A = this chain, B = another copy of it.
């Protein structure tokens, strides 16, 4: 009947997870992946955003920055290290790219081994059950499938201003940049913006972040501001309430010199600054517009680009499914895309009825001082259950590892948000400190089990470990008592 049982459009986290699982049940599967280049020409291999141009390289460079601090710390612990150690950009990129290459290859082998056809072509619906794939050299091929999975992801957004596409870079370009960016302006206050600002600073570069309004929209703002205070105290410059209106090249190079003109958000005040590199981290746009969805009848939100979907990841067209960042009002993270792909395959081809649970999905922002969160922000808890029913227990802590280097006391911060109407249920968990993700993972699991403050209090701490602060939280915001 059809060429394939399933055709997956997009070879990112979600698509590949779906492919691997579907093939496990003997189904004929094809993955189409194609990385349309950056304005400046940057391309990469199989695996999608996370592998090539997201989580993996980002965390690796965050580690380069952390190791910078390790070198400093080591002195007081007795290691005889030269007072200032210099860092080499090109060496770091070679090592990162080398790793990304092995993952690119890893996936290509993985799909071959599981009998999944991988086609490096750009997919585009032409009609019911039919898709056209255009390869790099321009050749077209038409394929049919019983079902389709849109796993097409997003790409970085540009400001609609002169000079942006020609002289600025995005996260897409940064992680393979063939030269050290030098003095950098990061435009935006998304997690990607602050993560990159942070590690570029940790490697010793002069970094400025230009923000429109608030830091980390979507996240608990009390933590957001704490992250910002920390970055500002550790070198990073902030320009608040400004957006660039023009970027112009003073001199080309590697890096060259650029002038950025920015306008105030609440007045006609204009400022100028010159930078070596200008990074645009102001959000991402869904890749749902240029894939022929009209030819097949799939409905999307025309304003936001996102695809509405059932709690089973089904679009309005029964045989077409969508997963990943593309989805309307879900969670835009790699492991969510993976779980969604795995579970869809099992529902479709293995008789399972288990759905992807998008509630209380944990995250971590890898800022210089890491931020891990799970559940409701304080604001959202108050909105949902009422100020009077929310008790917020909090405390500062000082990692033992920081005492000998003698730095950053009363900076790491722990808070939980509890619902008094529901047995002091822990509806929100937030930590600012080292290894925030390692700390947050298990408390994410405790939320799935309906963790209560009585239960958390009864759990014994591990000593001396940062996470133990959560075992003995006794001071509430409402009490007004000090936590220094």
A: residues with CB less than 8 A from B are: 50, 55-56, 59-60, 63-64, 67-68, 70-71, 73-74, 76-82, 85-92, 95-96, 99, 203, 331, 333-336, 339, 354, 357, 361-364, 372, 400-401, 403-404, 435, 437-446, 448-452, 455-456, 458-468, 470-471
Contacts and interface: CB of A to CB of B under 8 A. Distances in A.
A364 to B, nearest CB: 5
A82 B82 contact: yes
B70 A91 contact: no
Nearest to A334: B463
A467 B455 contact: no
Given A74-B85, A438-B438, A449-B452, 12 more contacts: A50-B463, A63-B401, A71-B74, A78-B203, A335-B471, A357-B460, A362-B460, A364-B465, A441-B467, A442-B470, A443-B446, A446-B449
A85 B77 CA distance: 12
A466 B438 contact: yes
A63 B69 CA distance: 13
A85 B81 CA distance: 6
A123 B351 CA distance: 70
Nearest to A374: B462
Nearest to A466: B438
Contacts of A64: 74, 77-79
Contacts of A446: 442-443, 445-446, 448-449, 451
A452 B446 CA distance: 10
A363 B462 contact: yes
Contacts of A91: 76, 78
Contact of A463 (B70, B331, B335): B335
A404 B79 contact: no
Contacts of A67: 70, 73-74, 77, 79
Contacts of A461: 335, 362, 441
Contacts of A331: 460
Given A99-B404, A435-B435, A445 B442 contact: yes
Contacts of A465: 364, 437-438, 441
A80 B70 contact: no
- Most chain B beta carbons < 10 A, residue from A63, A80, A361, A470: A63
Contact of A462 (B74, B335, B456): B335
- Most chain B beta carbons < 10 A, residue from A76, A86, A92, A363: A76
Given A80-B85, A460-B361, A438 B467 contact: yes
A216 B68 CA distance: 35
Given A92-B78, A460-B336, A60 B442 contact: no
